[PDB]
Write a protein that binds this DNA or RNA. Sequence first.
RNA 1: UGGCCGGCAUGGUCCCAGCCUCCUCGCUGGCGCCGGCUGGGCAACACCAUUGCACUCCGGUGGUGAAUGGGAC
Length: 95
Amino acid sequence: PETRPNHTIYINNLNEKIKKDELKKSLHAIFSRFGQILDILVSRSLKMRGQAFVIFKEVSSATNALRSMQGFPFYDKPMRIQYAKTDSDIIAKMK
RNA sequence: UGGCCGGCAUGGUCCCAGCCUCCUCGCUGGCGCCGGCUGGGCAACACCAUUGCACUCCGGUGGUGAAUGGGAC
Ligand SMILES: [Sr+2]
Ligand SMILES: [Sr+2]
């Protein structure tokens, strides 16, 4: 079952050999044009590696980012993008 | 040598260059042969496993089973 629109996009299929700090930097480099980004969360743990959460301030940004960068070759791999199942805390602490 | 021991070999002190390494990366570390014991840590690196929905840092295993020469006294 797909997912409903969200402030946060969930990206996976990312190159696992990239360190956390660099991955966050590179992700911002390509995703900041879609709108203000509140934060990017990345973890290299067994369960969370290869994935990232880009948290946009406005849902239109996420939606854009989602449609525009679906399948984008990043670090030699096609980026897969979806909306996050639930709202990230940063967003809850507001709306 | 990450810590520890044994056997054998080996004149010494330096100077220059090169080379080596998971555990004080370098000029007041190290760079003969052989065998056995043991500690730490995944931080870097590699390999294996993982396609995974978080907002709690947190998979496993491996490496030293390493590295040459010149010169001055
Ligand atoms: Sr050493
Ligand atoms: Sr590890």
